[PDB]
Amino acid sequence: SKSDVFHLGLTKNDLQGAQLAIVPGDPERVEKIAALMDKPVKLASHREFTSWRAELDGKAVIVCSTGIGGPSTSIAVEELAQLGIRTFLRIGTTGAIQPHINVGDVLVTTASVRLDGASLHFAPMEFPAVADFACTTALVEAAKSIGATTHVGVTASSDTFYPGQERYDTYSGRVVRRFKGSMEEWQAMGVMNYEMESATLLTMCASQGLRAGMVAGVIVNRTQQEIPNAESHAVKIVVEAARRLL
Amino acid sequence: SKSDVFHLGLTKNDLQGAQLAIVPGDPERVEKIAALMDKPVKLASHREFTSWRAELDGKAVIVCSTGIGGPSTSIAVEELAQLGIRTFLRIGTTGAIQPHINVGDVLVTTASVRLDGASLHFAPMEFPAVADFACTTALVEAAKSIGATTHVGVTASSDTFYPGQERYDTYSGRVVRRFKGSMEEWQAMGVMNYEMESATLLTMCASQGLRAGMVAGVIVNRTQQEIPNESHAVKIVVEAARRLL
């Protein structure tokens, strides 16, 4: 049963005809998401790529972690595509950069500011990191049905957690010129949030005939602090959206 | 004679509370679009900017031409915004670059490849030239209501009609390095079409808290020919406007 793909350790058989994947960043969240669906089965775990299969309305669905960042995301998406996935719904965590966005709010990304590198490996910068219309629609309509506080708009997608998101509470306390004042700039432009995979995901899918949607739960409000203290709606929405896209 | 803006020749009062504008490229289309709504009145014509007011479900609507290209578009949108317009629906013509997108088809742009310069005057290239979700939804729903062969997706928005759209039917018959082989590249990336205002419109709106939608009627298929030779799309943009008031 040699793997069809280099990193994921999966064969087409493992998908059982699945064409949709829910793709969290954290491998540890994969089982948790899969458990919200019928007949969840662990498939594989290699590096940051943990994969489970489950069933939604009688149809197989994949849950597969991407790890943090465009590079590992690009591997997961490519290899899932090779295996037969055609629709990707990213479920992530995010830092809000608008003052009235609450922790736990669900942010649906229409398109992303490409503060990444991997997107450029699929399309030049001019190309929009835009989500699929059907996927975005499914997410918004799912959000409506469950009644979660939801915001829809543009997301800044960064290759770093720290300087690219203009965090200063760091070892160096320095932010390179490019990102000095960048958060205020994005804020003024109505950008809702920061995360770290959507630019890559959306660009690589939109430029390769794959459908992608992007949703995230807010874990910190950056107008207040750089790092949240210790302590669902977005996940409920991503699963419900997947239902609509089968 | 009075105008609250430098180019359009319009006062805020002329808008009669309008918060939505339909923005075709061609000044000659303005009257045609206005005619589909109630109480159409000509407001002004200056340079490439012809404006009419009309009424849709008891609400004032502006129709104002942008002229061809990001620069004149940026002026029209900015000045309309100064006057109170918050939702912009572009209705254009377009060249399809996908083999199965036919002349007469209606194309709704989710976001644009920024092959323009004006978008960069509002946001750096990294920023997506993305349409407003509500506007795009309204356009897709309007397309269903009117009836059209409709495609939804990415559009290449060029500062030129010729080399930036890799046309060779030109004086020089050549295309700068940047654009050599570019059409086939966009085609491979699933880009539907070329037009000349959406990157500017979508970027300037998305980065300034304005809502923008983008729809165009296909007048040529570029896999077949370079030189082309809009009622469906106009009905759709008007129907979309009705949903966004």
Place this chain on the structure above:
Amino acid sequence: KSDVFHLGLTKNDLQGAQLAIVPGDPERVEKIAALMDKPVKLASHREFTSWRAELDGKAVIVCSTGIGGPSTSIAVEELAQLGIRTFLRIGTTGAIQPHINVGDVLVTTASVRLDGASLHFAPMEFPAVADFACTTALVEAAKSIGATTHVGVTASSDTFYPGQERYDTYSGRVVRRFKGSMEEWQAMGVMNYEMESATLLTMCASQGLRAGMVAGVIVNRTQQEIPNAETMKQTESHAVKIVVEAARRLL
């Protein structure tokens, strides 16, 4: 009948014309043509209004470009297809140097490429430079008319507002790229802002076409962000006389 997609013109319409005067504003076309011999209207489609007239026995086209490089690129390309080899732009402009007064005439040697369309003809490193003969004719024409004239670099912007660092706008913001840009151009001795020359000059200089660029100063940005609507016409009259006189020297 049209040989070209946008302009609605045929080679027959040019009557052997090899020079075009290209204002941004369609309304100015008739005005420019009125300074020449037996002007006649040819066509009006979108922002492209065209007239033909004569200057000492030679046919000359006057054709508007509309605002911005994109529509300019269409007009110039299609005129080139029709046989035009020399283009003189006559524009309006905002001066950014303190002692360039309203009504002054500015002749552009080359432009700061703050546009996108120029890039569709040549990479950024290529100069948006005017043709030597055209620039010479404009400078000489300025002396013939007797206008206060400055010759030098022009910033050619794809926007009227943020690219010219105007702040009295809907957003009241200017993107990082253009924050402080006006002061920078000022310090570099850039004379003025307008919106078509970068495209015009680049597309011509990279395609064997001759181009010149002249504009009348309708505002000085070191005293006003807003152009005075009533003083614009007389101010532009000098520059219009100059572009026509320059054309006379290039035939």
Place this chain on the structure above:
Amino acid sequence: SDVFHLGLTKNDLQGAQLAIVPGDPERVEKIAALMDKPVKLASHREFTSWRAELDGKAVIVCSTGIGGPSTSIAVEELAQLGIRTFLRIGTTGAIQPHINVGDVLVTTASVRLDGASLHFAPMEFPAVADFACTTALVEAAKSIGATTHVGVTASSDTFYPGQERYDTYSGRVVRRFKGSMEEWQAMGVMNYEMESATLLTMCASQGLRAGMVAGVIVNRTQQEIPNAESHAVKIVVEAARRLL
């Protein structure tokens, strides 16, 4: 747990100032076990961290995950906790015809085909390794007699198009990377990997020392996908000994 991702405290490091940073979390324990007193510290996301002792000194082994972004998190958070020297041990695809599978490649500097490096320094800044770290790696390689090459590495944000792999879903490579492998080959670039540009750039621009070593798992002149290299691991540990 106090650093946001790694879940580590300063105390967990017990004074460690050097970290060995593999890409794969599953390799962390394996590397730690080659040294004295290996102890698991934490595992969160792709970040598995162990402590060990080398010649009496505390050392950290911590995975970066694949790519600059996760690397940048691990390096930053380790630096917050006192790590000043980072030795990446990776896998790599060789692009020079005479560089064989099992060969050890020591990177002097990287071609920045990533995005995260730009979050620390503009492109003009060199993704250069620390001289002492590179020296230790080279001398460690010489000590065990491993077939070793020293030079430039192309560090890519993708495994596929950025390394001009065509055996993919789309079979497409974006214009930027079309013909890129041959160009790097002609420029004497030894190999592709996916973290060094970020690692080297972020360290070189922040007063941190970084070294980069990788074991060759495929030669790209032969095939795109590696057949499903303890020399490289031996070398990184021995190099670490010289850097304490």
Place this chain on the structure above:
Amino acid sequence: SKSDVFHLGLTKNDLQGAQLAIVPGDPERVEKIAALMDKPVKLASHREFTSWRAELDGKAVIVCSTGIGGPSTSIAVEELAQLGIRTFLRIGTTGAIQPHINVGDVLVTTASVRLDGASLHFAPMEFPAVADFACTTALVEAAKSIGATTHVGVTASSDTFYPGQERYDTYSGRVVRRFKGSMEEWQAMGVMNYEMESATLLTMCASQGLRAGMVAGVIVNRTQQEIPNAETMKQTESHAVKIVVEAARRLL
């Protein structure tokens, strides 16, 4: 201080009120240019910067070598500007890229393709590497007066002699992607020629209120060969030198 500037070894006094400098690349050409004017005298020589002073129309004129390339050019121009030079006329050698621009032809540059780095230290790439109108006019008129097959237009100004000018007869025989096919591109765009200082010179002057002109003698046609023939260089050089001096006369 026996020098008011760091590299050139000159004081303001040495200029004797000169406001115009002729700036060849080759230190060896400095005396040759000076010798065509009145009261020529050596000033200084440090590194690639050899300076002479002469007189035209009773006005002092500097001749100062720049060395090859934008970097050394930027030093010479800056330090001369500090000393009071406001007008710079470069006289250079050049490779023609157009088929009908021939060895021995004289080329006057209106503006340059910025294939250099130093220009970017004065203005962003969007800014035109454009010559001064009065200077260009004087060079064109000068070329017409003394006799010369003259072309006026755009020049590609490269930081390298080899790959940036798409020369393949080199150690590596390779040309980086950016410059592969570049000569044909410039040719199609009507670019006349390659040289190595004008982008820096023109940009730094046009963006700092200084006047610059650029003239060069064609020593090779690149549609024919990569390396210039030695036989035709001396005559081409002296010919362009006569033109630059005549231009200077018109600008004083």
Place this chain on the structure above:
Amino acid sequence: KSDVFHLGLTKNDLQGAQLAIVPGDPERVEKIAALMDKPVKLASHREFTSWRAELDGKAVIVCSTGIGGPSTSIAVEELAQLGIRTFLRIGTTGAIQPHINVGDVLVTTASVRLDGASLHFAPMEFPAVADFACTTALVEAAKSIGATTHVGVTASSDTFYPGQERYDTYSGRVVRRFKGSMEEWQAMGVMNYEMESATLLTMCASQGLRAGMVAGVIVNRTQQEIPNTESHAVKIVVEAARRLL
């Protein structure tokens, strides 16, 4: 007759030399040559003065580059054509770290590419990195004579003035790109400014040639803009050459 267009040198002039020491200043060429056996003048053309000498029975070239990447690229290329495979630059430099003093010796591992010529050999993403053997030899040579030596990154600029953020100039202006740049490089641990290494290191590293870079500090920029290791750095480069033959 010369085998190369600028240097005025033949392969025979080199007498089998495979290493060249490349100072910027033609006037320092003989001074470096005089530290080795049998120094003899080869040629002087433009900024390119070349001598040959002998080190441990092996021929060595000393050849000036002139200031800047452009002239450097000519000298390196033409020397490479004549058989040189190892290039050791010895220069002067302005220190930008407060902990570095005038007379200190700086060995460059890699350079910030603030030049243009490097781009003619490799795109910006490519590292302007020194050869490991050359760097090692320079470091070891430095340690052998006990000179105060720092090893690390160097900012290599196409200008002496604005690119090194000098304001004591005709214009007193520094273009936006370089505004605040010295502080930026300082914070990033960059040791110094000079004007040839980015070109040298990039062109060599991308063409299978070995390059090393060493410089003597003639000013510290935290103290002054304009300068007021002559022997130390020269002794080091010659001793390093010895180890690389």
